Design an enzyme around this catalytic site. Structure first.
Site, PDB file in Angstrom:
ATOM      1  CG  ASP A 129      -1.979   1.245   1.136  1.00 25.19           C
ATOM      2  OD1 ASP A 129      -2.352   1.579   0.050  1.00 25.19           O
ATOM      3  OD2 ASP A 129      -2.589   1.749   2.093  1.00 25.19           O
ATOM      4  CG  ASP A 352      -8.046  -7.528   6.185  1.00 18.86           C
ATOM      5  OD1 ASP A 352      -6.944  -7.965   6.032  1.00 18.86           O
ATOM      6  OD2 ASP A 352      -8.982  -8.048   5.433  1.00 18.86           O
TER       7      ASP A 352
END
Length: 413
Positions: A129, A352
């Site tokens: 990311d 997550d």
């Protein structure tokens, strides 16, 4: 040199910590012996206050003297996750110096010790990311001031460069740069630009392409390895698969097509001819009763596509605890042209992120992309988040999700 493929002819590390949570769930023993990456997602994970040294010692023990491979995720850039509503990354946007001295350097120091054991292969996953945010999230609807800042200050590019050099010098470390997934950088407009930025990073902070062993896609995500019933060039009557709301003129409908094209693009840009690609298949099985068993019969473009696709998400930008997901293909060596391995980098069953605010001391802000009720933003087509309800803090055990992942495994167990 280093071996051509660190996964080739090697045993894979089994994380005793993860294994114990998997085996404890009904039927979890079936997958509790699978290899998962160890995540160094904050400074405190290094010493563990199992630390890196602890996991590496365990890997050595499991090796018995033959080659063995442990995956370590490097994930603490300053201004981390610059497009996210909230980031758990402890390092702020101006904190590159702390990233270098208090995060990378001590990790390098531990891996160096272990270089003395020839048959240990450390595959390092470099900063998920990160870089592709500087392609796609710097302008327009969905652009963030944080991403623009990290692009301007070179924090991501230089941080990543630094890690590549420091870890890349180490003889038995194999660096893979995270390469997002096809539902992020698969378009004509961002694929090439991402390639350029990968190359920039690899040459930053003293690094060269000779410190990059490959790239990894789909890390901690849910995009399909192959879509069995979907052809990116196919058609539903007179209408192209390309024009569907799902595909949205992406060049790819799956990860394998994507990393194979990316691999070629990267070599052309100037990466080593022998780069291999990884795909994380931890949670992209998309099996169970909802899995299509063949192509749709519907004459509607979007009903054909929605009924034929194994990735059942609302939008490819939905990344948090995705409803209905299943365990993917188990970790496997050189499954396809240009792929070093399918890997389980994200350890399944670990959340997550939290689905509500859960007050905490470890600095983890509520990210609404994990909230089932969130109605989205520009980056997910302004859609429901698709996240599973009542999720714990990121990395904490999520039993409801593990049971679901387990029942939806493909191939089945």
């Amino acid at each position: 040199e280093k071996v051509d493929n660190p996964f080739e002819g090697a045993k894979l590390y089994v994380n005793p910590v993860w294994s114990a949570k998997a085996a404890a769930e009904p039927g979890g023993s079936a997958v509790a012996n699978e290899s998962t990456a160890v995540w160094l997602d904050r400074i405190g994970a290094i010493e563990g206050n199992m630390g890196l040294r602890d996991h590496l010692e365990e890997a050595v023990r499991q090796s018995g003297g033959d080659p063995l491979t442990i995956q370590v995720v490097i994930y603490n850039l300053p201004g981390r996750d610059c497009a996210a509503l909230a980031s758990n990354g402890e390092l702020g946007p101006d904190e590159l110096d702390r990233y270098k001295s208090e995060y990378i350097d001590p990790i390098a120091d531990i891996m160096w010790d272990f270089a003395d054991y020839e048959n240990l292969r450390i595959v390092a996953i470099i900063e998920i990311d990160s870089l592709p945010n500087l392609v796609t999230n710097v302008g327009g609807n969905g652009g963030t001031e944080l991403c623009a800042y990290m692009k301007q200050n070179g924090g991501y590019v230089n941080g990543v460069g630094y890690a590549l050099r420091k870890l890349g010098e180490i003889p038995n470390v194999y660096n893979y740069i995270d390469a997002a997934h096809h539902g992020w950088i698969g378009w004509d407009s961002n694929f090439g630009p991402s390639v350029d930025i990968f190359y920039e990073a690899a040459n930053a902070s003293g690094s060269t392409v000779d410190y990059v062993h490959g790239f990894i896609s789909n890390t901690a995500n849910y995009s399909a390895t192959v879509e069995p019933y979907l052809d990116v060039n196919g058609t539903v009557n007179g209408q192209l698969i390309r024009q569907s709301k799902w595909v949205d003129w992406n060049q790819y409908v799956d990860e394998l097509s994507f990393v194979q094209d990316l691999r070629q693009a990267l070599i052309a840009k100037g990466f080593r001819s022998d780069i291999g690609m990884l795909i994380d298949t931890s949670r992209n099985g998309w099996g169970g009763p909802n899995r299509p068993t063949g192509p749709s019969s519907s004459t509607d473009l979007n009903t054909y596509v929605d009924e034929s696709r194994i990735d059942r998400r609302i939008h490819p930008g939905n990344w948090c605890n995705q409803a209905g997901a299943g365990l993917g293909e188990r970790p496997t060596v050189n499954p396809a042209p240009g792929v070093d391995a399918y890997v389980w980098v994200k350890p399944p069953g670990e959340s997550d992120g939290a689905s509500e605010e859960i007050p905490n001391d470890e600095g983890k802000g509520f990210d609404r992309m994990c909230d089932p009720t969130y109605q989205g933003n520009a980056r997910n087509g302004n859609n429901p988040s698709g996240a599973l309800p009542n999720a714990p803090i990121s990395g904490h055990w999520f039993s409801a999700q593990f049971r679901e992942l387990l029942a939806n495994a493909y191939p089945p167990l």
